[PDB]
Design an enzyme around this catalytic site. Structure first.
Site, PDB file in Angstrom:
ATOM      1  CE1 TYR A   1      -3.491   2.808   0.585  1.00 49.39           C
ATOM      2  CE2 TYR A   1      -1.589   3.708   2.011  1.00 49.39           C
ATOM      3  CZ  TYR A   1      -2.883   3.892   1.472  1.00 49.39           C
ATOM      4  OH  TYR A   1      -3.423   5.065   1.867  1.00 49.39           O
TER       5      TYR A   1
ATOM      6  CG  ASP B   1      -8.770  -2.784   1.155  1.00 52.24           C
ATOM      7  OD1 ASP B   1      -7.904  -3.334   2.195  1.00 52.24           O
ATOM      8  OD2 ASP B   1      -8.647  -1.431   1.421  1.00 52.24           O
TER       9      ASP B   1
ATOM     10  CE  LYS C   1     -10.606  -4.184   7.889  1.00 48.05           C
ATOM     11  NZ  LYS C   1      -9.541  -3.079   8.016  1.00 48.05           N
TER      12      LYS C   1
HETATM   13  C1  B12 Z   1     -10.846   5.649  -4.825  1.00 48.33           C
HETATM   14  C2  B12 Z   1     -10.671   6.273  -3.431  1.00 48.33           C
HETATM   15  C3  B12 Z   1      -9.633   6.504  -3.068  1.00 48.33           C
HETATM   16  C4  B12 Z   1      -8.318   5.833  -3.261  1.00 48.33           C
HETATM   17  C5  B12 Z   1      -7.737   6.537  -4.380  1.00 48.33           C
HETATM   18  C6  B12 Z   1      -6.846   5.705  -5.313  1.00 48.33           C
HETATM   19  C7  B12 Z   1      -5.736   6.624  -6.296  1.00 48.33           C
HETATM   20  N1  B12 Z   1      -4.562   6.303  -6.173  1.00 48.33           N
HETATM   21  O1  B12 Z   1      -6.193   7.533  -6.829  1.00 48.33           O
HETATM   22  C8  B12 Z   1      -7.250   6.024  -1.848  1.00 48.33           C
HETATM   23  C9  B12 Z   1      -7.137   4.716  -1.349  1.00 48.33           C
HETATM   24  C10 B12 Z   1      -6.047   6.700  -2.181  1.00 48.33           C
HETATM   25  C11 B12 Z   1      -8.319   6.665  -1.130  1.00 48.33           C
HETATM   26  C12 B12 Z   1      -7.937   7.287   0.249  1.00 48.33           C
HETATM   27  C13 B12 Z   1      -8.421   8.231   0.945  1.00 48.33           C
HETATM   28  N2  B12 Z   1      -9.426   8.783   0.919  1.00 48.33           N
HETATM   29 CO1  B12 Z   1     -10.772   8.494  -0.457  1.00 48.33          CO
HETATM   30  N3  B12 Z   1     -11.979   7.346  -1.985  1.00 48.33           N
HETATM   31  C14 B12 Z   1     -12.019   6.730  -3.050  1.00 48.33           C
HETATM   32  C15 B12 Z   1     -13.426   6.559  -3.644  1.00 48.33           C
HETATM   33  C16 B12 Z   1     -13.775   5.262  -3.531  1.00 48.33           C
HETATM   34  C17 B12 Z   1     -13.568   7.172  -5.187  1.00 48.33           C
HETATM   35  C18 B12 Z   1     -13.023   8.472  -5.248  1.00 48.33           C
HETATM   36  C19 B12 Z   1     -12.927   8.408  -7.057  1.00 48.33           C
HETATM   37  O2  B12 Z   1     -11.832   9.087  -7.656  1.00 48.33           O
HETATM   38  N4  B12 Z   1     -13.978   8.176  -7.755  1.00 48.33           N
HETATM   39  C20 B12 Z   1     -13.813   8.037  -9.081  1.00 48.33           C
HETATM   40  C21 B12 Z   1     -13.631   9.198 -10.053  1.00 48.33           C
HETATM   41  C22 B12 Z   1     -13.669   8.739 -11.605  1.00 48.33           C
HETATM   42  O3  B12 Z   1     -14.619  10.341 -10.157  1.00 48.33           O
HETATM   43  P1  B12 Z   1     -14.473  11.697  -9.524  1.00 48.33           P
HETATM   44  O4  B12 Z   1     -13.717  12.030  -8.521  1.00 48.33           O
HETATM   45  O5  B12 Z   1     -15.865  12.288  -9.516  1.00 48.33           O
HETATM   46  O6  B12 Z   1     -13.958  12.245 -10.912  1.00 48.33           O
HETATM   47  C23 B12 Z   1     -14.822  12.645 -12.194  1.00 48.33           C
HETATM   48  C24 B12 Z   1     -15.341  14.335 -11.764  1.00 48.33           C
HETATM   49  O7  B12 Z   1     -15.326  14.624 -10.508  1.00 48.33           O
HETATM   50  C25 B12 Z   1     -14.482  15.241 -12.730  1.00 48.33           C
HETATM   51  N5  B12 Z   1     -13.208  15.454 -12.332  1.00 48.33           N
HETATM   52  C26 B12 Z   1     -12.297  14.950 -11.139  1.00 48.33           C
HETATM   53  N6  B12 Z   1     -11.215  15.612 -11.002  1.00 48.33           N
HETATM   54  C27 B12 Z   1     -11.279  16.703 -11.699  1.00 48.33           C
HETATM   55  C28 B12 Z   1     -10.437  17.572 -12.047  1.00 48.33           C
HETATM   56  C29 B12 Z   1     -10.384  18.744 -13.036  1.00 48.33           C
HETATM   57  C30 B12 Z   1      -9.340  19.716 -13.251  1.00 48.33           C
HETATM   58  C31 B12 Z   1     -11.837  18.616 -13.843  1.00 48.33           C
HETATM   59  C32 B12 Z   1     -11.730  19.433 -15.199  1.00 48.33           C
HETATM   60  C33 B12 Z   1     -12.625  17.438 -13.727  1.00 48.33           C
HETATM   61  C34 B12 Z   1     -12.396  16.539 -12.679  1.00 48.33           C
HETATM   62  O8  B12 Z   1     -14.106  14.225 -13.915  1.00 48.33           O
HETATM   63  C35 B12 Z   1     -14.048  12.964 -13.393  1.00 48.33           C
HETATM   64  C36 B12 Z   1     -14.186  11.784 -14.459  1.00 48.33           C
HETATM   65  O9  B12 Z   1     -15.808  11.974 -15.024  1.00 48.33           O
HETATM   66  C37 B12 Z   1     -14.237   7.897  -2.746  1.00 48.33           C
HETATM   67  C38 B12 Z   1     -15.808   7.142  -2.450  1.00 48.33           C
HETATM   68  C39 B12 Z   1     -16.663   7.322  -3.527  1.00 48.33           C
HETATM   69  N7  B12 Z   1     -17.525   6.500  -3.999  1.00 48.33           N
HETATM   70  O10 B12 Z   1     -16.633   8.673  -4.222  1.00 48.33           O
HETATM   71  C40 B12 Z   1     -13.333   7.915  -1.562  1.00 48.33           C
HETATM   72  C41 B12 Z   1     -13.459   9.196  -0.712  1.00 48.33           C
HETATM   73  C42 B12 Z   1     -13.113  10.284  -1.991  1.00 48.33           C
HETATM   74  N8  B12 Z   1     -12.116   9.411   0.008  1.00 48.33           N
HETATM   75  C43 B12 Z   1     -12.296   9.997   1.017  1.00 48.33           C
HETATM   76  C44 B12 Z   1     -10.998  10.091   1.949  1.00 48.33           C
HETATM   77  C45 B12 Z   1     -11.463  11.087   3.311  1.00 48.33           C
HETATM   78  C46 B12 Z   1     -10.083   9.599   1.850  1.00 48.33           C
HETATM   79  C47 B12 Z   1      -8.799   9.824   2.866  1.00 48.33           C
HETATM   80  C48 B12 Z   1      -8.119  11.348   2.558  1.00 48.33           C
HETATM   81  C49 B12 Z   1      -9.014   9.402   4.317  1.00 48.33           C
HETATM   82  C50 B12 Z   1      -7.307   9.504   5.139  1.00 48.33           C
HETATM   83  N9  B12 Z   1      -7.017   8.237   5.508  1.00 48.33           N
HETATM   84  O11 B12 Z   1      -7.085  10.329   5.718  1.00 48.33           O
HETATM   85  C51 B12 Z   1      -7.834   8.723   2.235  1.00 48.33           C
HETATM   86  C52 B12 Z   1      -6.236   9.039   2.004  1.00 48.33           C
HETATM   87  C53 B12 Z   1      -5.912   9.580   0.710  1.00 48.33           C
HETATM   88  C54 B12 Z   1      -5.060  10.923   0.781  1.00 48.33           C
HETATM   89  N10 B12 Z   1      -4.043  10.922   1.415  1.00 48.33           N
HETATM   90  O12 B12 Z   1      -5.550  12.017   0.375  1.00 48.33           O
HETATM   91  C55 B12 Z   1     -13.501  10.608   1.228  1.00 48.33           C
HETATM   92  C56 B12 Z   1     -13.678  12.232   1.004  1.00 48.33           C
HETATM   93  C57 B12 Z   1     -14.954  12.740   1.899  1.00 48.33           C
HETATM   94  C58 B12 Z   1     -14.769  14.142   2.302  1.00 48.33           C
HETATM   95  N11 B12 Z   1     -14.039  14.326   3.409  1.00 48.33           N
HETATM   96  O13 B12 Z   1     -15.155  15.305   1.798  1.00 48.33           O
HETATM   97  C59 B12 Z   1     -14.569   9.488   0.503  1.00 48.33           C
HETATM   98  C60 B12 Z   1     -15.598  10.282  -0.421  1.00 48.33           C
HETATM   99  C61 B12 Z   1     -14.886   8.344   1.324  1.00 48.33           C
HETATM  100  C62 B12 Z   1     -15.693   8.524   2.607  1.00 48.33           C
HETATM  101  N12 B12 Z   1     -16.607   9.109   2.665  1.00 48.33           N
HETATM  102  O14 B12 Z   1     -14.969   8.293   3.488  1.00 48.33           O
HETATM  103  N13 B12 Z   1      -9.315   7.003  -1.569  1.00 48.33           N
HETATM  104  C1  LIG Z   2      -3.235  -0.898   3.917  1.00 46.58           C
HETATM  105  C2  LIG Z   2      -3.208   0.481   4.687  1.00 46.58           C
HETATM  106  N1  LIG Z   2      -2.353   0.973   5.360  1.00 46.58           N
HETATM  107  C3  LIG Z   2      -2.508   2.202   5.969  1.00 46.58           C
HETATM  108  C4  LIG Z   2      -3.460   3.100   5.781  1.00 46.58           C
HETATM  109  C5  LIG Z   2      -3.263   4.435   6.356  1.00 46.58           C
HETATM  110  O1  LIG Z   2      -3.126   5.320   5.274  1.00 46.58           O
HETATM  111  P1  LIG Z   2      -1.949   6.557   5.536  1.00 46.58           P
HETATM  112  O2  LIG Z   2      -2.044   6.888   6.816  1.00 46.58           O
HETATM  113  O3  LIG Z   2      -0.554   5.939   5.381  1.00 46.58           O
HETATM  114  O4  LIG Z   2      -2.171   7.706   4.784  1.00 46.58           O
HETATM  115  C6  LIG Z   2      -4.385   2.613   4.789  1.00 46.58           C
HETATM  116  C7  LIG Z   2      -5.451   3.345   4.420  1.00 46.58           C
HETATM  117  N2  LIG Z   2      -6.520   3.214   3.686  1.00 46.58           N
HETATM  118  C8  LIG Z   2      -7.438   4.220   3.562  1.00 46.58           C
HETATM  119  C9  LIG Z   2      -8.591   3.966   2.528  1.00 46.58           C
HETATM  120  S1  LIG Z   2     -10.057   4.777   2.912  1.00 46.58           S
HETATM  121  C10 LIG Z   2     -10.887   5.210   1.120  1.00 46.58           C
HETATM  122  C11 LIG Z   2     -12.231   4.123   0.602  1.00 46.58           C
HETATM  123  N3  LIG Z   2     -12.223   3.922  -0.546  1.00 46.58           N
HETATM  124  C12 LIG Z   2     -13.449   4.777   1.347  1.00 46.58           C
HETATM  125  O5  LIG Z   2     -14.592   4.834   0.670  1.00 46.58           O
HETATM  126  O6  LIG Z   2     -13.622   5.559   2.737  1.00 46.58           O
HETATM  127  C13 LIG Z   2      -4.473   1.382   4.306  1.00 46.58           C
HETATM  128  O7  LIG Z   2      -5.391   0.772   3.452  1.00 46.58           O
END
Ligand code: B12
Ligand SMILES: Cc1ncc(COP(=O)(O)O)c(/C=N/CCSC[C@H](N)C(=O)O)c1O
Ligand SMILES: C[C@H]1O[C@@H](n2cnc3c(N)ncnc32)[C@H](O)[C@@H]1O
Lengths: 520, 259, 84, 520
Positions: free
Chosen positions: A264, A299, A371
């Site tokens: 991860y 996951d 899990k």
């Molecule tokens: C995938 C995901 C992740 C992945 C991302 C993998 C990766 N490498 O990209 C990972 C595992 C990293 C992750 C982590 C976290 N995430 Co997250 N994640 C998601 C998830 C499941 C999908 C988001 C997504 O990208 N959707 C798919 C794309 C295609 O859709 P999109 O964003 O809408 O994009 C479209 C449009 O918005 C637009 N668009 C988007 N960006 C842009 C930019 C421009 C310039 C333009 C023109 C258009 C545009 O066009 C796109 C295509 O149509 C959501 C839940 C959900 N179902 O929405 C949570 C979610 C976004 N995450 C969330 C959170 C909190 C986190 C964390 C920050 C929490 C933490 N641990 O501290 C972590 C850590 C990441 C970090 N350090 O920032 C929250 C945010 C809610 C809020 N607080 O407002 C969500 C909603 C989940 C939740 N409720 O708990 N996440």
């Molecule tokens: C394996 C492992 N090890 C450590 C961390 C801590 O992260 P970090 O502190 O190092 O930044 C994680 C975090 N997973 C966040 C996914 S939550 C997004 C989800 N799609 C939603 O809908 O909520 C992890 O999976």
């Protein structure tokens, strides 16, 4: 012969397991001959060094930076700490304070015979080991006294960013049917090279992982467990550039679960792979000794790749993680290998595919506390269909006996849960788990059906991927972007400057103590 | 019934089961213990909200000091659907070949786009859908566009790195990805980026695009950005907007025009 | 985020993740065709209902002339729990 | 071969079926010797008499009341109608109009030879029977043209009370995805002893069952089904004091489904048992000839009784209804026997018991278009848990292969469904039916498990109840409140005055034409 519902090919499973074992042998060849700065800072923390200096930097950081810049860190922090202990005669914490204030220079003291340094450090090493062992004993005593569940453990996350509101809502959820409480970490803590000090009332996306936060939440959960008459677990994440440090802090503060996966970090935080592997070895040694259940994060692969096309990648990663954990000394009972209910909700017979995959995972790893985690990728703004999807997730969890159940939330796609969203999720999960309490032992599967064929297909694909990865090596396979479809350069990422090469006289007291005390 | 009414587009109100009943549903928590006083407080709050004659269909205690309510009630307020001024996000997209032809005919040189998920945010799925040539649901990204040189800088990019790379590569437009408004750090990060660009003096020479799962055009324009894109956006919309705005306001760009 | 985070029983308002955020949820149907204008009409209706910065999370067509909305947003209004 | 997932005791099922057959034979002995005023009114309607008099009384009512008061209804209204036709030479409608106006007197006309009367009445009976056969052919042609579904049929209800708003809501629901639309009938019409004439614009709790309303609804659904490319069925309720009249009106207007059950009226509406049985025989004969799917109301037993204790009651009622239908001439493919998902959600292993009962019902009646109906008793104001319960109900439906599926609403306990509630229910049902499409073919059950033992238990209890009812007699058992914990006396209830004894020269052509028609 092993019992199965999917008529699995057990010879193929054995071959996949052997391929994963050989992969881990090849990767461990390198890990044995290197160490990182985080490992040395963890040794300093275990020896008793703690606190902060005037500028706000922790004392382990100061000691390790001094040893690195002025001296040879390939000898380990233990060598220099012990030598200073012989010279001045003080305790490690006092030496760290003196170094921080500038009254001492560890690298200028004459070096004593290494045998005397080992003898000097052994007593403190044994004291810390015994403290961790007593914490394990206390956790086992609590579980024995209160009794343990037989069904799934409901798993909720509290993420307000304030430690005290986290305590309040964690107690509120524990008073509801929650069994494991995880405090999601603050965004951009994995990037830091130091572990903050003291309790934190601020944080964006979560709470900082500090020792005082651990102590506060452990106290709160102990009080709530006394109230409710059942044991409430505490979870945290050992990822980042300070993985072994957080592992040690959790071991000392008696956390019961810990998210420990290096893939991860490499794939989703862009940390160097060598750094993360070398950190992960020591952190998993500590977690195995401490009695903590390590949770992996396959996951996350599906949120980037496709779940139907790349389902075998999760199984291959799970086998590799199993072998890593086994080399670190962790038994199967502490190996919480993770998988998710993550296919397209518009896929015909998608439920059968998820059921087949979950049963295959439950069959390959029979002892593990597996899990299962909710759907996230395909969650939309319809809270009602989201509740329905979560219900199907719980149905799969109860039909195939998953030990840990990460509750999905009504409003995943919108925001982090409210109090009411968590209450509703717990209520639905309890309803479904009570009604189908004994559905796992009733329903079987048609011989040659969709479920059996799907399971065998995924297993064969995983075996082929494991053979490929074994041929190249893990680092090369990561370079070519096979897990999560993310290509990561070998020498890129963050933290490659913290990796160092072991000296022929490198000394780390704790590895032997934690690897032989648990075995004898 | 004697005094039931028909639809009127100037006074539309919700529709439960009759044209102008205006029935609404709402749920919320209160930091007070359950009881009759909690129900009365929720009813009074609902009446103050606008829902005349509310009826609490559910109420249960989440904790010793918290209660969760569900309410149905007939609304009083009405909205005028004919005079609504909508928002400025209405846009239609030309095909890829049309975009290439437009760029060739009007500007005469390639358009450079630099995109990143600046700040501490890690997500890149949406920005990879918009940028990456693989596309998203059949809509090919900017990188695929023949007359567009698109760079993908990944996530966790500091704003300083973003602006430095934009200056180095000669970017004409910059794209910034964020997340839902419940993330409150996106506002501060976007404001900081705008301030950095203003200090550098490059703001006038490039366009600014900010988007995310719940970013909106109104907020983007309020911050000072030139546009805002939400869910359902595809690469063709972004490409069309960039080319059309660049020709309309004649953005000079940084291509061969380093600061 | 809110300036006030300590519970006051003269000004109790809804609870989300923090004490005084006042987050509310509400769903309704509107007899207007789905589109951007319908979303703006729903937002305006919510705003005049007393919600600050309403944020439509869902909007779907039920028929050719009906649209179903789900809205989240903070609530301005406060109720005195002691005087009831 | 009789293949069974629950290892049923087929000998026990055969014995229960034989007991039900004997009970129905004993009850039929009484039915064949009596006729009701409603049956005579239905015969008059089928001859062609329709309309209202100056005072608003329906013309068939006036005619039947005239023969009853002045003449001797034991002969049958057909005899008098035919005698008038021979004597005056007018058509039945003109004869009825003259009788209403007082210009003619049926009893003052000398009685002619019965042979000529029979011929004259059969001349028009044949035409009416041919029209009903034409409607059946038309229904089959629509079904063939559009093709028929393979999964469960979604079933929704519209209860605005105004026919035109009902049409609008039904069209919207059909476009949303409903396969069957049922217009819930106006409250307190089952107690009414006549069928209104013309359309109705206002009603309490539903819409009146009138021929004009049937015509309008059929037109609207035909247009929408042509628009959508699939067939939308139309359902309505026959039970009441005017059961046979509504059955005939539905047969004429091409209704695809119809709720036809005597026991519901007898118990939950306090209608006399003899009246309801005699009405039911003819109404079921008409429904069987017309090709209408007849549904039974065993769901209502559980709302007034306990589901776990009283499932054998539902099974015995289903077997009795099956035998009644068979004697009436309805084939197995038109016997939509009903049961409900009404167990306590707080019951551990409740889903297993529901699944066992549903599979037993699906196995004992392998050809019927069974109907499965939602939970209603244990619903509350928590719409989210209501949605979850509905999801589990859909899961049972798909896993046991129930042909018709009465969609439940998350707002069951609050109010009649909004449009959005129906949309959410349809969306959830679609999702669950798509994901688990072939789950019925895959999942088996453990031999001797909970499900098999539950099915065998319920079967044996039903067999014992059927033996008791055979020993006592159906009427006495109804007096003893064995079926819904409701005791209705034999000689009590509404409508006893309408029952009559058949004269030896009693004449009714429609019975013969409709019973002999299906045999070619
Ligand atoms: C995938 C995901 C992740 C992945 C991302 C993998 C990766 N490498 O990209 C990972 C595992 C990293 C992750 C982590 C976290 N995430 Co997250 N994640 C998601 C998830 C499941 C999908 C988001 C997504 O990208 N959707 C798919 C794309 C295609 O859709 P999109 O964003 O809408 O994009 C479209 C449009 O918005 C637009 N668009 C988007 N960006 C842009 C930019 C421009 C310039 C333009 C023109 C258009 C545009 O066009 C796109 C295509 O149509 C959501 C839940 C959900 N179902 O929405 C949570 C979610 C976004 N995450 C969330 C959170 C909190 C986190 C964390 C920050 C929490 C933490 N641990 O501290 C972590 C850590 C990441 C970090 N350090 O920032 C929250 C945010 C809610 C809020 N607080 O407002 C969500 C909603 C989940 C939740 N409720 O708990 N996440
Ligand atoms: C394996 C492992 N090890 C450590 C961390 C801590 O992260 P970090 O502190 O190092 O930044 C994680 C975090 N997973 C966040 C996914 S939550 C997004 C989800 N799609 C939603 O809908 O909520 C992890 O999976
Ligand atoms: C952040 C913590 O919760 C899990 N996490 C949270 N929600 C989801 C989800 N729906 N799907 C996958 N993982 C998730 C992570 O795996 C980790 O345990």
């Amino acid at each position: 012969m092993r019992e199965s519902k999917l008529n699995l090919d057990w010879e193929l499973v054995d071959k996949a397991r052997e391929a994963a074992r050989n992969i881990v042998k090849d990767t461990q060849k390198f890990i044995d001959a290197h160490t990182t700065v985080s490992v040395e800072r963890t040794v300093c923390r275990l020896l008793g060094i703690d606190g902060v200096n005037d500028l706000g930097v922790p004392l382990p950081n100061v000691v390790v930076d001094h040893i690195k810049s002025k001296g040879n860190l390939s000898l380990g922090a233990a060598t220099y700490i012990g030598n200073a202990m012989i010279y001045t005669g003080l305790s490690p914490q006092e030496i760290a304070e003196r170094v921080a204030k500038g009254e001492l220079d560890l690298t200028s003291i004459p070096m004593a015979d290494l045998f005397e340094i080992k003898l000097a450090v052994q007593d403190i090493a044994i004291k810390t080991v015994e403290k961790i062992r007593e914490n394990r004993r206390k956790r086992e005593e609590f579980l024995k006294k209160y009794g343990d569940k037989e069904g799934p453990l409901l798993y909720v996350i509290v993420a307000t960013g304030n430690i005290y509101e986290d305590v309040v809502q964690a107690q509120a959820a524990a008073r509801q049917g929650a069994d494991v409480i995880a405090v999601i970490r603050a965004t951009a803590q994995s990037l830091l090279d130091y572990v903050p000090y003291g309790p934190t009332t601020e944080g964006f996306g979560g709470t900082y992982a500090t020792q005082e936060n651990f102590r506060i939440m452990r106290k709160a959960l102990d009080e709530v467990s006394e109230e409710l008459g059942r044991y409430i677990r505490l979870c945290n994440y050992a990822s980042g550039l300070c993985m072994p440090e957080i592992a040690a802090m959790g071991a000392l503060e008696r956390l019961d679960v810990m998210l420990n996966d290096a893939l991860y970090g490499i794939l989703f935080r862009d940390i160097n792979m060598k750094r993360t592997m070398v950190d992960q070895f020591f952190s998993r040694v500590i977690n195995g000794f401490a009695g903590i259940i390590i949770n992996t994060g396959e996951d996350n692969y599906l949120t980037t790749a496709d779940a139907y096309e790349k389902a075998h990648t999760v199984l291959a990663s799970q086998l590799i993680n199993e072998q890593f954990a086994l080399i670190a000394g962790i038994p199967e009972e502490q190996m919480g290998l993770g998988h998710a209910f993550e296919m397209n909700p518009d896929l015909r017979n998608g439920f059968l595919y998820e059921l087949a995959q979950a049963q295959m995972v439950r069959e390959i790893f029979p002892k593990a506390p597996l899990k299962y985690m909710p759907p996230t990728k395909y969650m939309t703004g319809n809270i009602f269909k989201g509740h329905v999807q979560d219900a199907m997730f719980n149905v799969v969890t109860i039909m195939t006996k998953q030990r840990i159940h990460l509750l999905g939330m009504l409003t995943e796609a919108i925001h982090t849960p409210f109090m009411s969203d968590r209450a509703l999720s717990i209520e639905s999960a309890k309803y479904i788990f009570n009604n189908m309490a004994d559905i796992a032992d009733e329903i079987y599967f048609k011989e040659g059906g969709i479920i059996q064929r799907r399971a065998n297909e995924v297993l064969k694909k995983a075996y082929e991927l494991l053979k490929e990865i074994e041929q190249e090596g893990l680092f090369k396979a990561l370079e070519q972007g096979k897990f999560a479809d993310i290509k990561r350069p070998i020498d890129g990422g963050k933290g490659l400057e913290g990796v160092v090469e072991k000296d022929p006289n490198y000394f780390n007291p704790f590895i032997d103590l934690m690897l032989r005390g648990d075995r004898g | 019934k004697q005094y039931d009414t028909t639809l009127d587009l100037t006074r539309v109100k919700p529709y439960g089961d009759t044209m102008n009943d205006g029935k609404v549903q709402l749920s919320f928590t209160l930091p007070v213990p359950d009881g009759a006083k909690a129900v009365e407080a929720a009813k009074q709050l609902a009446k103050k909200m606008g829902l005349e004659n509310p009826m609490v269909v559910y109420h249960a205690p989440l904790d010793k000091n918290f209660t969760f309510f569900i309410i149905y009630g007939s609304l009083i307020h009405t909205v005028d659907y004919t005079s609504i001024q909508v928002q400025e996000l209405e846009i239609k997209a030309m095909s890829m070949e049309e975009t290439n032809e437009y760029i060739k005919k009007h500007i005469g040189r390639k358009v450079v786009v630099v995109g990143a998920t600046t700040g501490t945010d890690a997500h890149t799925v949406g920005l990879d859908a918009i940028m990456n040539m693989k596309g998203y649901a059949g809509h090919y990204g900017l990188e695929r566009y023949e007359m567009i040189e698109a760079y993908n800088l990944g996530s966790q990019v500091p704003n300083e790195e973003f602006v430095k790379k934009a200056i180095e590569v000669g970017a004409d437009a910059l794209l910034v990805s964020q997340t839902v408004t419940q993330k409150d750090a996106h506002i501060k990060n976007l404001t900081h980026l705008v301030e950095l660009l203003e200090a550098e003096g490059i703001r006038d020479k490039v366009l600014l695009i900010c988007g995310g799962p719940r970013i909106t055009h109104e907020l983007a324009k309020e911050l000072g950005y030139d546009a805002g894109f939400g869910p359902g956006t595809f690469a063709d919309h972004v490409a069309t907007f960039i080319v059309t705005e660049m020709v309309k306001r004649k953005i000079p760009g940084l291509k061969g025009y380093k600061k």
